[PDB]
């Protein structure tokens, strides 16, 4: 019932839920995603903080805006793995914020929304790029 969706959700959900308190490809992809994504957050903290400030997330209504950003980016016909990893990395950065404001329950839905839009808009590109195996290869060593 859509293995690509299931796999994508497992990887993306595990990474985002890790900010709150099964196959070989999925495990390696999670390790790659965390390694690259945590690096992006570390190196781009000021930029990410400024983007988060613009979102001004203080309540449930504000979390709607974030799903709209994801839709907005992935609706762009331009696709590459850098964009995919960066958007997920920003999702994890926001997930940390959600934890600190006692909105942990928004994190799993955020991961689901990211996954939904990613797969709905980029399925063909993802498969052409060898899916999550391709992701692991692109960011390898």
């Amino acid at each position: 019932g859509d293995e690509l969706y299931r796999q994508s959700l497992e990887i993306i959900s595990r990474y985002l839920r890790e900010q709150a308190t099964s196959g070989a490809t999925s495990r390696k992809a999670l390790e790659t995603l965390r390694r690259v994504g945590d690096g992006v957050q570390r190196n781009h903290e000021t930029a990410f903080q400024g983007m988060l400030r613009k979102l001004d997330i203080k309540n449930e209504d504000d979390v709607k805006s974030l799903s709209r950003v994801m839709i907005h980016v992935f609706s762009d016909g331009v696709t590459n793995w850098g964009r995919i990893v960066t958007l997920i990395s920003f999702g994890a950065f926001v997930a940390k914020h959600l934890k600190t404001i006692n909105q942990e329950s928004c994190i799993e839905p955020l991961a689901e929304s990211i996954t939904d839009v990613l797969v709905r808009t980029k399925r063909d590109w993802l498969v052409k790029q060898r899916g999550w195996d391709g992701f692991v290869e692109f960011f390898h060593v």
């Binding site: 690259v36 930029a47 964009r83």
Partner: peptide, 20 residues
Amino acid sequence: IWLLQELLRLGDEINARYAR
């Protein structure tokens, strides 16, 4: 507009870094 565009641009810069 600036926010979406800045994220897209960062993603493209990260893409170029790892495509290298």
